[PDB]
Amino acid sequence: IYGWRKRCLYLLVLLLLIILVVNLALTIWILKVMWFSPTGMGHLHV
Amino acid sequence: TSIAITGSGSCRHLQFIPVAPPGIPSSVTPPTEVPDRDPEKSSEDDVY
C-alpha cells in the first residue's frame, strides 16, 4: 500500500534528519574546544 | 669646646653623648602577605 510505503519513506527521512542534527551538534563541539584555525589547533600551529 | 661620645660597631643602637634627642621612629607598615596558589582546573569549556 503506497500509504505505509510513503510513511516509512519519510520515517527514514526523519532518521536521517536526527543523525544530521546530532552530527552538527558534535561538530560544533569539536570546533569549540579546539579553538580551530586553518593554521592549526589552538593558538599554536601544527 | 665640645665632646661627642657616640656608639658604633656593636653599639649601633646606642648614643652616649646627651644631646637631648626627642627622635621617636615610626613603625613599619604591615605588608599584606601574597601566597600564590595554582591548583588544576577542569575546562570552563564544559559549560559551553
Side-chain angles (χ1 to χ4, degrees), chain A residues 1-6 8-46, chain B:
Chain A
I1 290 73
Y2 197 51
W4 69 281
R5 189 157 177 164
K6 297 184 294 296
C8 65
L9 265 177
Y10 64 93
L11 167 72
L12 206 53
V13 172
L14 175 82
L15 288 174
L16 192 143
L17 170 67
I18 63 170
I19 301 176
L20 196 53
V21 169
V22 63
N23 202 0
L24 276 296
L26 276 296
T27 61
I28 288 311
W29 176 19
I30 208 75
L31 178 75
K32 181 266 290 181
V33 285
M34 213 165 79
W35 268 257
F36 163 71
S37 67
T39 61
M41 183 278 288
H43 199 64
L44 61 83
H45 323 304
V46 173
Chain B
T1 74
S2 68
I3 302 167
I5 62 170
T6 64
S8 174
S10 294
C11 313
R12 292 308 305 158
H13 67 94
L14 293 183
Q15 49 94 26
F16 280 155
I17 192 66
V19 66
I24 299 303
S26 310
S27 178
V28 65
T29 176
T32 302
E33 287 184 352
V34 297
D36 186 74
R37 182 65 263 169
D38 289 298
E40 62 86 20
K41 64 90 176 179
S42 167
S43 58
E44 314 316 312
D45 311 327
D46 305 336
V47 174
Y48 201 72

Coordinates of all heavy atoms in Angstrom, one line a residue, unseen atoms left out:
Chain A
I1 N 0.9 -1.2 0.0 CA 0.0 0.0 0.0 C 0.9 1.2 0.0 O 1.6 1.5 1.0 CB -1.0 0.0 1.2 CG1 -2.1 -1.1 1.1 CG2 -1.6 1.4 1.4 CD1 -1.6 -2.5 1.3
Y2 N 0.8 2.0 -1.1 CA 1.7 3.2 -1.2 C 1.6 4.0 0.1 O 2.6 4.8 0.4 CB 1.4 4.0 -2.4 CG 2.4 5.0 -2.8 CD1 3.7 4.6 -3.0 CD2 2.1 6.4 -3.1 CE1 4.7 5.5 -3.4 CE2 3.1 7.3 -3.5 CZ 4.4 6.9 -3.6 OH 5.4 7.7 -4.0
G3 N 0.5 3.9 0.9 CA 0.4 4.7 2.1 C 1.5 4.4 3.1 O 2.3 5.3 3.4
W4 N 1.6 3.2 3.6 CA 2.7 2.9 4.5 C 4.0 2.9 3.8 O 5.0 3.1 4.5 CB 2.4 1.5 5.1 CG 2.5 0.3 4.2 CD1 1.6 -0.1 3.3 CD2 3.6 -0.5 4.1 NE1 2.1 -1.2 2.6 CE2 3.3 -1.5 3.0 CE3 4.9 -0.7 4.7 CZ2 4.2 -2.5 2.7 CZ3 5.7 -1.7 4.3 CH2 5.4 -2.6 3.3
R5 N 4.1 2.8 2.5 CA 5.3 3.0 1.8 C 5.8 4.4 2.0 O 7.0 4.6 2.3 CB 5.1 2.7 0.3 CG 6.3 2.6 -0.6 CD 6.1 1.8 -1.8 NE 7.3 1.8 -2.7 CZ 7.5 0.9 -3.7 NH1 6.6 0.0 -3.9 NH2 8.6 1.1 -4.4
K6 N 5.0 5.4 1.7 CA 5.3 6.8 1.9 C 5.6 7.0 3.4 O 6.5 7.8 3.7 CB 4.2 7.7 1.4 CG 4.0 7.6 -0.1 CD 3.0 8.7 -0.5 CE 1.6 8.4 0.1 NZ 1.0 7.1 -0.4
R7 N 4.8 6.4 4.3 CA 5.0 6.6 5.7 C 6.4 6.2 6.1 O 7.2 7.0 6.8 CB 4.0 5.8 6.5
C8 N 6.9 5.0 5.8 CA 8.2 4.5 6.1 C 9.3 5.3 5.4 O 10.4 5.5 5.9 CB 8.4 3.0 5.9 SG 8.3 2.5 4.2
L9 N 8.9 5.8 4.2 CA 9.9 6.7 3.5 C 10.2 7.9 4.3 O 11.4 8.2 4.5 CB 9.3 7.1 2.1 CG 9.7 6.2 0.9 CD1 9.0 6.6 -0.3 CD2 11.2 6.2 0.7
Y10 N 9.2 8.7 4.7 CA 9.6 9.9 5.5 C 9.9 9.5 6.9 O 10.5 10.4 7.6 CB 8.6 11.0 5.4 CG 7.2 10.8 5.9 CD1 6.9 11.2 7.2 CD2 6.2 10.3 5.1 CE1 5.6 11.0 7.7 CE2 4.9 10.2 5.6 CZ 4.6 10.5 6.9 OH 3.4 10.4 7.3
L11 N 9.7 8.3 7.4 CA 10.3 7.9 8.6 C 11.8 7.7 8.5 O 12.5 8.2 9.4 CB 9.6 6.6 9.1 CG 10.4 5.8 10.2 CD1 10.2 6.5 11.5 CD2 9.9 4.4 10.3
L12 N 12.2 7.2 7.4 CA 13.7 7.1 7.1 C 14.2 8.5 6.9 O 15.4 8.8 7.4 CB 13.9 6.3 5.9 CG 15.3 5.6 5.8 CD1 15.6 4.8 7.0 CD2 15.4 4.7 4.5
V13 N 13.5 9.4 6.3 CA 13.9 10.8 6.2 C 14.1 11.4 7.6 O 15.0 12.1 7.9 CB 12.9 11.6 5.4 CG1 13.2 13.1 5.5 CG2 12.9 11.1 4.0
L14 N 13.2 11.1 8.6 CA 13.3 11.6 9.9 C 14.6 11.0 10.6 O 15.2 11.7 11.3 CB 12.1 11.1 10.7 CG 12.1 11.4 12.2 CD1 11.7 12.9 12.5 CD2 11.2 10.5 13.0
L15 N 14.9 9.7 10.4 CA 16.1 9.2 10.9 C 17.3 9.8 10.4 O 18.3 10.1 11.1 CB 16.1 7.7 10.7 CG 15.2 6.8 11.5 CD1 15.2 5.3 11.0 CD2 15.5 6.9 13.0
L16 N 17.3 10.1 9.1 CA 18.5 10.8 8.5 C 18.6 12.3 9.1 O 19.7 12.8 9.3 CB 18.4 10.8 7.0 CG 19.6 11.3 6.1 CD1 19.6 10.4 4.9 CD2 19.4 12.7 5.7
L17 N 17.4 12.9 9.3 CA 17.4 14.2 10.0 C 18.0 14.2 11.3 O 18.8 15.1 11.7 CB 15.9 14.7 10.1 CG 15.7 15.9 10.9 CD1 16.3 17.2 10.2 CD2 14.2 16.1 11.1
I18 N 17.7 13.2 12.2 CA 18.2 13.2 13.5 C 19.7 12.9 13.5 O 20.5 13.5 14.3 CB 17.5 12.2 14.4 CG1 17.7 10.8 13.9 CG2 16.0 12.6 14.5 CD1 17.3 9.7 14.8
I19 N 20.2 12.1 12.6 CA 21.6 11.8 12.5 C 22.3 13.1 12.1 O 23.4 13.4 12.6 CB 21.9 10.6 11.6 CG1 21.2 9.4 12.2 CG2 23.4 10.3 11.6 CD1 21.3 8.1 11.3
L20 N 21.8 13.8 11.1 CA 22.4 15.1 10.7 C 22.4 16.1 11.9 O 23.4 16.8 12.1 CB 21.7 15.7 9.5 CG 22.5 16.8 8.8 CD1 23.9 16.3 8.5 CD2 21.8 17.3 7.6
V21 N 21.3 16.1 12.7 CA 21.3 17.1 13.8 C 22.3 16.8 14.8 O 23.1 17.7 15.3 CB 19.9 17.1 14.4 CG1 19.9 17.9 15.7 CG2 18.9 17.8 13.4
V22 N 22.4 15.5 15.2 CA 23.4 15.1 16.2 C 24.8 15.3 15.6 O 25.8 15.7 16.4 CB 23.2 13.7 16.7 CG1 23.3 12.7 15.7 CG2 24.1 13.4 17.9
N23 N 25.0 15.1 14.3 CA 26.4 15.3 13.8 C 26.8 16.7 13.8 O 27.9 17.1 14.1 CB 26.4 14.7 12.4 CG 27.9 14.4 11.9 OD1 28.8 14.6 12.7 ND2 28.0 13.9 10.7
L24 N 25.8 17.7 13.5 CA 26.2 19.1 13.6 C 26.5 19.5 15.0 O 27.3 20.3 15.3 CB 25.1 20.0 13.0 CG 25.1 20.3 11.5 CD1 26.3 21.0 11.1 CD2 24.9 19.0 10.6
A25 N 25.7 18.9 16.0 CA 26.0 19.2 17.4 C 27.4 18.8 17.8 O 28.2 19.5 18.4 CB 25.0 18.6 18.3
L26 N 27.8 17.5 17.4 CA 29.1 17.1 17.7 C 30.2 17.9 17.0 O 31.3 18.1 17.6 CB 29.3 15.6 17.4 CG 28.8 14.5 18.3 CD1 29.7 14.6 19.6 CD2 27.4 14.6 18.8
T27 N 30.0 18.3 15.8 CA 31.0 19.1 15.1 C 31.1 20.5 15.6 O 32.2 21.1 15.6 CB 30.7 19.1 13.6 OG1 29.5 19.7 13.3 CG2 30.8 17.7 13.0
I28 N 30.0 21.1 16.1 CA 30.2 22.4 16.7 C 30.9 22.3 18.0 O 31.8 23.1 18.4 CB 28.8 23.1 17.0 CG1 28.2 23.6 15.6 CG2 28.9 24.2 17.9 CD1 29.2 24.4 14.8
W29 N 30.7 21.2 18.8 CA 31.5 20.8 19.9 C 33.0 20.7 19.5 O 33.9 21.3 20.1 CB 31.0 19.6 20.6 CG 31.9 19.1 21.7 CD1 32.8 19.8 22.4 CD2 31.9 17.7 22.3 NE1 33.3 19.0 23.4 CE2 32.8 17.7 23.3 CE3 31.2 16.6 22.0 CZ2 33.1 16.6 24.1 CZ3 31.4 15.4 22.7 CH2 32.3 15.4 23.8
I30 N 33.3 20.0 18.4 CA 34.7 19.6 18.0 C 35.4 20.9 17.6 O 36.6 21.0 17.6 CB 34.7 18.5 17.0 CG1 36.0 17.7 17.0 CG2 34.6 19.1 15.6 CD1 36.0 16.8 18.2
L31 N 34.6 21.9 17.1 CA 35.2 23.2 16.7 C 35.4 24.0 17.9 O 36.4 24.8 18.0 CB 34.3 23.9 15.7 CG 34.7 25.3 15.3 CD1 35.9 25.2 14.3 CD2 33.6 26.1 14.6
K32 N 34.6 23.9 19.0 CA 34.7 24.9 20.1 C 35.9 24.6 21.0 O 36.7 25.5 21.2 CB 33.4 24.9 20.9 CG 33.3 25.8 22.0 CD 33.7 25.2 23.4 CE 32.6 24.2 23.8 NZ 32.9 23.5 25.1
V33 N 36.0 23.4 21.5 CA 37.0 23.1 22.5 C 38.4 23.0 21.8 O 39.4 22.8 22.5 CB 36.7 21.8 23.2 CG1 35.6 22.0 24.2 CG2 36.3 20.7 22.2
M34 N 38.5 23.2 20.5 CA 39.7 23.0 19.7 C 40.3 24.4 19.3 O 41.5 24.4 18.9 CB 39.5 22.2 18.5 CG 40.7 21.3 18.1 SD 40.2 20.1 16.9 CE 40.1 21.0 15.4
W35 N 39.5 25.5 19.5 CA 40.0 26.8 19.0 C 40.5 26.8 17.6 O 41.5 27.4 17.2 CB 41.1 27.4 20.0 CG 40.6 28.2 21.1 CD1 40.6 29.6 21.2 CD2 40.0 27.8 22.3 NE1 40.1 30.0 22.4 CE2 39.7 28.9 23.1 CE3 39.7 26.5 22.9 CZ2 39.2 28.9 24.4 CZ3 39.2 26.5 24.1 CH2 38.9 27.6 24.9
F36 N 39.8 26.0 16.8 CA 40.4 25.6 15.5 C 40.6 26.7 14.5 O 39.7 27.6 14.4 CB 39.5 24.5 14.9 CG 39.8 24.2 13.4 CD1 40.9 23.6 13.1 CD2 38.9 24.7 12.4 CE1 41.2 23.4 11.7 CE2 39.2 24.4 11.1 CZ 40.3 23.8 10.8
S37 N 41.7 26.7 13.8 CA 42.1 27.6 12.8 C 42.7 26.9 11.7 O 43.3 25.8 11.9 CB 43.0 28.7 13.4 OG 44.3 28.2 13.7
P38 N 42.7 27.4 10.5 CA 43.4 26.8 9.4 C 44.9 26.7 9.6 O 45.6 25.8 9.1 CB 43.2 27.7 8.1 CG 42.6 29.0 8.7 CD 41.9 28.6 10.0
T39 N 45.5 27.6 10.4 CA 46.9 27.4 10.9 C 47.1 26.2 11.7 O 48.1 25.4 11.4 CB 47.3 28.7 11.7 OG1 46.5 28.7 12.9 CG2 47.1 29.9 10.9
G40 N 46.2 25.9 12.6 CA 46.3 24.7 13.4 C 45.4 24.7 14.6 O 44.7 25.7 14.8
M41 N 45.5 23.7 15.4 CA 44.8 23.6 16.6 C 45.2 24.7 17.6 O 46.4 25.0 17.8 CB 45.0 22.2 17.3 CG 44.2 21.9 18.6 SD 45.0 22.6 20.1 CE 46.4 21.5 20.2
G42 N 44.2 25.3 18.2 CA 44.5 26.3 19.3 C 45.2 27.6 18.7 O 45.0 28.0 17.5
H43 N 46.0 28.2 19.5 CA 46.8 29.4 19.1 C 48.2 29.0 18.5 O 48.8 29.8 17.9 CB 47.0 30.3 20.2 CG 47.3 31.7 19.8 ND1 46.5 32.5 19.0 CD2 48.4 32.5 20.0 CE1 47.1 33.7 18.8 NE2 48.3 33.7 19.4
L44 N 48.6 27.7 18.7 CA 49.8 27.3 18.1 C 49.6 26.9 16.6 O 48.5 27.1 16.1 CB 50.4 26.1 18.8 CG 49.6 24.8 19.0 CD1 49.7 23.8 17.9 CD2 50.1 24.1 20.3
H45 N 50.6 26.3 16.0 CA 50.4 25.8 14.6 C 51.1 24.4 14.5 O 52.3 24.3 14.8 CB 51.0 26.7 13.6 CG 50.8 28.2 13.9 ND1 49.6 28.8 14.1 CD2 51.7 29.2 14.0 CE1 49.8 30.1 14.4 NE2 51.0 30.3 14.3
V46 N 50.3 23.4 14.1 CA 50.9 22.1 13.8 C 51.3 22.1 12.4 O 50.4 21.9 11.5 CB 49.9 21.0 14.2 CG1 50.4 19.6 13.7 CG2 49.6 20.9 15.7
Chain B
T1 N 86.3 72.5 73.4 CA 85.0 73.2 73.2 C 83.8 72.2 73.3 O 82.9 72.4 74.1 CB 84.9 73.9 71.8 OG1 84.7 72.9 70.8 CG2 86.2 74.7 71.6
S2 N 83.8 71.1 72.6 CA 82.7 70.2 72.6 C 83.3 68.7 72.6 O 84.4 68.5 72.2 CB 81.8 70.3 71.4 OG 82.5 69.9 70.2
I3 N 82.5 67.9 73.3 CA 82.8 66.4 73.3 C 81.6 65.7 72.8 O 80.4 66.0 73.2 CB 83.1 66.0 74.7 CG1 84.3 66.7 75.3 CG2 83.4 64.5 74.7 CD1 84.6 66.5 76.8
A4 N 81.8 64.8 71.9 CA 80.7 64.0 71.3 C 81.1 62.5 71.4 O 81.8 62.0 70.5 CB 80.4 64.4 69.9
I5 N 80.5 61.8 72.4 CA 80.8 60.4 72.5 C 79.6 59.6 71.9 O 78.5 59.8 72.3 CB 81.0 60.0 74.0 CG1 79.8 60.3 74.9 CG2 82.2 60.7 74.6 CD1 79.9 59.7 76.3
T6 N 79.9 58.8 70.8 CA 78.9 58.2 70.0 C 79.3 56.7 69.9 O 80.5 56.3 69.9 CB 78.9 58.8 68.6 OG1 80.1 58.6 67.9 CG2 78.6 60.3 68.7
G7 N 78.3 55.8 69.9 CA 78.5 54.4 69.8 C 78.5 54.0 68.3 O 78.0 54.6 67.4
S8 N 79.2 52.8 68.1 CA 79.3 52.2 66.8 C 79.6 50.7 67.0 O 79.6 50.2 68.1 CB 80.4 52.9 66.0 OG 80.7 52.3 64.7
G9 N 79.9 50.1 65.8 CA 80.2 48.7 65.9 C 79.1 47.8 66.4 O 78.1 47.6 65.7
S10 N 79.3 47.3 67.6 CA 78.2 46.6 68.3 C 77.3 47.5 69.1 O 76.4 47.0 69.8 CB 78.8 45.5 69.3 OG 79.5 44.5 68.5
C11 N 77.6 48.8 69.1 CA 76.8 49.8 69.8 C 76.0 50.7 68.8 O 76.0 51.9 69.0 CB 77.7 50.6 70.7 SG 78.8 49.7 71.8
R12 N 75.5 50.1 67.8 CA 74.8 50.9 66.7 C 73.6 51.6 67.3 O 73.3 52.7 66.9 CB 74.5 50.0 65.6 CG 75.7 49.5 64.8 CD 76.6 50.6 64.4 NE 75.9 51.6 63.6 CZ 76.3 52.9 63.5 NH1 77.4 53.3 64.1 NH2 75.6 53.8 62.8
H13 N 72.8 50.9 68.1 CA 71.6 51.4 68.7 C 71.8 52.3 69.9 O 70.8 52.6 70.6 CB 70.6 50.3 69.0 CG 71.1 49.4 70.1 ND1 70.7 49.6 71.4 CD2 71.9 48.4 70.1 CE1 71.3 48.7 72.2 NE2 72.0 47.9 71.4
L14 N 73.0 52.7 70.2 CA 73.4 53.4 71.4 C 74.1 54.7 71.0 O 75.1 54.7 70.3 CB 74.2 52.6 72.3 CG 73.5 51.4 72.9 CD1 74.5 50.7 73.9 CD2 72.3 51.8 73.6
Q15 N 73.6 55.8 71.6 CA 74.3 57.1 71.6 C 74.5 57.5 73.0 O 73.6 57.4 73.9 CB 73.6 58.2 70.8 CG 72.1 58.3 71.2 CD 71.8 59.4 72.3 OE1 72.6 60.3 72.4 NE2 70.8 59.2 73.0
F16 N 75.7 58.0 73.4 CA 76.0 58.2 74.8 C 76.3 59.6 75.2 O 76.4 59.9 76.3 CB 77.3 57.3 75.2 CG 76.9 55.9 75.4 CD1 77.9 54.9 75.3 CD2 75.6 55.5 75.8 CE1 77.5 53.6 75.5 CE2 75.3 54.2 76.1 CZ 76.3 53.2 75.9
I17 N 76.4 60.5 74.2 CA 76.5 62.0 74.5 C 75.1 62.5 74.6 O 74.3 62.3 73.7 CB 77.3 62.7 73.4 CG1 77.6 64.1 73.9 CG2 76.7 62.6 72.0 CD1 78.5 64.2 75.1
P18 N 74.7 63.1 75.7 CA 73.3 63.6 75.9 C 73.2 64.9 75.1 O 73.6 66.0 75.6 CB 73.2 63.8 77.4 CG 74.2 62.9 78.0 CD 75.4 62.9 77.1
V19 N 72.5 64.8 74.0 CA 72.1 66.0 73.2 C 70.6 66.3 73.4 O 70.1 67.2 72.7 CB 72.5 65.8 71.7 CG1 71.7 64.6 71.1 CG2 72.5 67.1 70.9
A20 N 70.0 65.6 74.2 CA 68.5 65.6 74.4 C 67.8 65.4 73.1 O 67.1 66.2 72.6 CB 68.1 67.0 75.0
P21 N 67.9 64.1 72.6 CA 67.3 63.9 71.3 C 65.8 63.4 71.5 O 65.6 62.4 72.2 CB 68.1 62.7 70.7 CG 68.8 62.1 71.9 CD 68.6 63.0 73.1
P22 N 64.9 64.1 70.9 CA 63.5 63.7 71.1 C 63.0 62.7 70.0 O 61.8 62.5 69.9 CB 62.7 65.0 71.0 CG 63.6 65.9 70.1 CD 65.0 65.4 70.2
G23 N 63.9 62.3 69.1 CA 63.5 61.4 68.0 C 62.8 60.1 68.3 O 63.3 59.3 69.1
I24 N 61.6 60.0 67.8 CA 60.8 58.8 68.0 C 60.5 58.2 66.7 O 59.7 58.7 65.9 CB 59.5 59.1 68.8 CG1 59.9 59.6 70.2 CG2 58.7 57.8 69.0 CD1 60.7 58.7 71.0
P25 N 61.2 57.1 66.3 CA 60.9 56.5 65.0 C 59.5 55.9 64.9 O 58.9 55.5 65.8 CB 62.0 55.4 64.9 CG 62.3 55.0 66.3 CD 62.1 56.3 67.1
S26 N 59.1 55.9 63.6 CA 57.7 55.3 63.3 C 57.8 53.8 63.3 O 58.8 53.2 63.6 CB 57.2 55.9 62.0 OG 57.3 57.3 62.0
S27 N 56.7 53.2 62.9 CA 56.5 51.8 62.8 C 56.5 51.3 61.4 O 55.9 52.0 60.5 CB 55.3 51.3 63.6 OG 55.2 49.9 63.5
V28 N 57.0 50.1 61.1 CA 56.9 49.6 59.7 C 55.5 49.2 59.4 O 54.8 48.6 60.2 CB 57.9 48.4 59.6 CG1 57.6 47.2 60.5 CG2 58.0 48.0 58.1
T29 N 55.0 49.6 58.2 CA 53.7 49.3 57.8 C 53.6 47.8 57.5 O 54.6 47.2 57.0 CB 53.3 50.1 56.6 OG1 52.0 49.6 56.1 CG2 54.3 49.9 55.5
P30 N 52.5 47.1 57.9 CA 52.4 45.7 57.7 C 52.0 45.4 56.2 O 50.9 45.7 55.8 CB 51.3 45.2 58.7 CG 50.5 46.5 58.9 CD 51.4 47.6 58.7
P31 N 52.9 44.7 55.5 CA 52.6 44.4 54.1 C 51.7 43.1 54.0 O 51.9 42.2 54.8 CB 53.9 44.1 53.4 CG 54.8 43.7 54.6 CD 54.3 44.2 55.9
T32 N 50.7 43.2 53.2 CA 49.8 42.0 53.0 C 50.5 40.9 52.4 O 51.2 41.0 51.3 CB 48.6 42.4 52.2 OG1 47.9 43.5 52.8 CG2 47.6 41.2 52.1
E33 N 50.5 39.7 53.0 CA 51.1 38.5 52.5 C 50.4 38.0 51.3 O 49.2 38.0 51.2 CB 51.1 37.4 53.6 CG 52.1 37.6 54.7 CD 52.2 36.5 55.7 OE1 51.4 35.6 55.6 OE2 53.1 36.5 56.5
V34 N 51.2 37.6 50.3 CA 50.6 37.3 49.0 C 51.1 35.9 48.5 O 51.9 35.7 47.6 CB 51.0 38.3 47.9 CG1 50.4 39.7 48.3 CG2 52.5 38.6 47.8
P35 N 50.5 34.8 49.2 CA 50.9 33.5 48.7 C 50.2 33.1 47.4 O 49.0 33.5 47.1 CB 50.3 32.6 49.8 CG 49.2 33.4 50.4 CD 49.6 34.8 50.3
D36 N 50.9 32.5 46.5 CA 50.5 32.1 45.2 C 50.1 30.7 45.1 O 50.9 29.8 45.4 CB 51.5 32.4 44.2 CG 51.1 32.2 42.7 OD1 50.3 33.1 42.3 OD2 51.4 31.2 42.1
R37 N 48.8 30.4 44.7 CA 48.3 29.0 44.6 C 47.9 28.8 43.2 O 47.1 29.5 42.6 CB 47.2 28.8 45.6 CG 46.6 27.4 45.6 CD 47.6 26.4 46.1 NE 48.3 25.7 45.0 CZ 49.4 25.0 45.1 NH1 49.9 24.7 46.3 NH2 49.9 24.4 44.0
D38 N 48.3 27.7 42.6 CA 48.0 27.3 41.3 C 47.4 25.8 41.3 O 48.2 24.9 41.0 CB 49.2 27.4 40.3 CG 49.5 28.8 40.0 OD1 48.7 29.5 39.4 OD2 50.7 29.2 40.3
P39 N 46.2 25.7 41.6 CA 45.5 24.3 41.5 C 45.1 24.1 40.1 O 44.9 25.0 39.3 CB 44.3 24.4 42.5 CG 43.9 25.9 42.4 CD 45.2 26.7 42.1
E40 N 44.8 22.8 39.8 CA 44.4 22.4 38.4 C 43.0 22.9 38.2 O 42.3 23.2 39.1 CB 44.6 20.9 38.2 CG 43.7 20.0 39.1 CD 42.3 19.8 38.6 OE1 42.1 20.0 37.3 OE2 41.4 19.4 39.3
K41 N 42.6 22.9 36.9 CA 41.3 23.3 36.5 C 40.8 22.3 35.5 O 41.5 21.9 34.6 CB 41.3 24.7 36.0 CG 42.1 25.0 34.7 CD 41.3 24.9 33.4 CE 42.1 25.3 32.2 NZ 41.4 25.1 31.0
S42 N 39.5 21.9 35.7 CA 38.8 21.4 34.5 C 38.4 22.5 33.6 O 38.3 23.7 34.0 CB 37.5 20.7 35.0 OG 36.6 20.4 33.9
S43 N 38.2 22.2 32.3 CA 38.0 23.2 31.3 C 36.7 23.9 31.6 O 35.6 23.3 31.8 CB 37.9 22.5 29.9 OG 36.9 21.5 29.9
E44 N 36.7 25.3 31.5 CA 35.5 26.0 31.5 C 34.7 25.8 30.3 O 33.5 26.3 30.2 CB 35.8 27.5 31.7 CG 36.8 27.8 32.9 CD 36.5 27.0 34.1 OE1 35.4 27.0 34.6 OE2 37.5 26.5 34.7
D45 N 35.3 25.2 29.2 CA 34.6 24.9 28.0 C 33.5 23.8 28.2 O 32.7 23.5 27.4 CB 35.6 24.4 27.0 CG 36.8 25.3 26.8 OD1 36.6 26.6 27.0 OD2 37.9 24.8 26.6
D46 N 33.6 23.1 29.4 CA 32.5 22.2 29.8 C 31.2 22.9 29.8 O 30.1 22.3 29.5 CB 32.8 21.5 31.1 CG 34.1 20.8 31.1 OD1 34.6 20.5 30.0 OD2 34.7 20.7 32.2
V47 N 31.2 24.2 30.2 CA 29.9 25.0 30.3 C 29.3 25.1 28.9 O 28.1 24.8 28.7 CB 30.2 26.3 30.9 CG1 29.0 27.2 30.9 CG2 30.7 26.2 32.4
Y48 N 30.1 25.5 27.9 CA 29.6 25.7 26.6 C 29.3 24.3 25.9 O 28.5 24.2 25.0 CB 30.6 26.5 25.7 CG 30.0 27.1 24.5 CD1 29.1 28.2 24.6 CD2 30.3 26.7 23.2 CE1 28.5 28.8 23.5 CE2 29.7 27.3 22.1 CZ 28.9 28.3 22.3 OH 28.3 28.9 21.1

